[PDB]
């Protein structure tokens, strides 16, 4: 299969901006980027298909360097219960869910008139599990309670089927690890993939791939059912099985076994991101250390002879220190997910160690409470897109389903919005670069993100100029 896209405007690169008028593709790689007429002549000689763009625009497809394909799929399938006015309507909306188990979200007891309970949902004859708006609480029916077998705690009200805090976290864990099957995960991943492709995203860094998600990805790959480039960053629990086969870094046609995903800290919203000084709006806490420097170095030393990348979630400024210390000691150039707060004094270390960073520009829009958490001075550390991209390799992501998956909505954020410093905005060209080649570089994918000769031909076709 050879195709020439002619008579249009093709961006091969956004850093620096380079436009051509013709593109020849064969065996899913770019063969030629240049003159429309030269491209036409090549395809005439070799007997390829001619695609006349008719003045349309082409660009490298988006590369989301950090998301959760399984969770995105679960989220697309969930029953939408936002704005439901009565228990009667809530029950009707839940009944209209397909799954052998019905998952849903977004109810509110104020909008309902009272709290939903186990007894209200016992009219539905399959397992039901329904988040509250906040996602900090869930209600379930008896069938679902029976499947979970949770131990008694102050976070679980068995009579009403309501879970909070810890017991909700444990409920999720049991659902994900015990109850959902490999087939369920294949379906989630396929729903996410369809959604992402329709948005122009052809490659993803898939973070926190657990046992069943991996089993689903190998199956989809050999079934020819993966339609996007999936760079899988596995949970560290999978290292035992990898070491027993000596299976490490491995590139299939779509699925890549690429890395390991770790977490130093939690999030600024929950006040669990690890700060060097206490929270401005809770001076009794500085967040939580989930994995320390020695524990990260231990995983890195296991990743090294398997040729695997290591991606480390660090949100708080002190978490960033822990991640930098770990990379320094292990002499390992890893990547950092989020890097939400970066101090001036940390910049030199990031530059010198060449740490790759995956950042989510839509966090700027969503996290309006940043100044409340950390104060005016530390808010200067937040989402420093322009600064980070000028000192190291940086890529754009959504952390979907946390943020919207639509890249144009995150591009708008990176270009137009800032926490406190308008100097941290990037230009439209830079944002497109970061969401294509930037992401590719951050995911160690050297033949993605551009449409020059030799690059994998992942492109999207647009009616309007993406630079306008
Ligand atoms: Zn994270
Ligand atoms: Zn994440």
Automatic annotation (TrEMBL):
Keywords: Metal-binding, Zinc. It comes from the Archaea. The modification N6-carboxylysine is found at residue 261. Coiled coil: none annotated. Residues 49-468 form the Amidohydrolase domain. This is Amidohydrolase 3 domain-containing protein. SUPFAM superfamilies: Composite domain of metallo-dependent hydrolases (SSF51338), Metallo-dependent hydrolases (SSF51556). Zn(2+) 1 binds at residues 66, 68, 261, 399. One of its GO terms (molecular function) is hydrolase activity, acting on carbon-nitrogen (but not peptide) bonds. Zn(2+) 2 binds at residues 261, 313, 338. InterPro entries: Amidohydro_3, DNase_TatD-rel_CS, Metal-dep_hydrolase_composite, Metal_Hydrolase, YtcJ-like. PROSITE patterns: TATD_1.
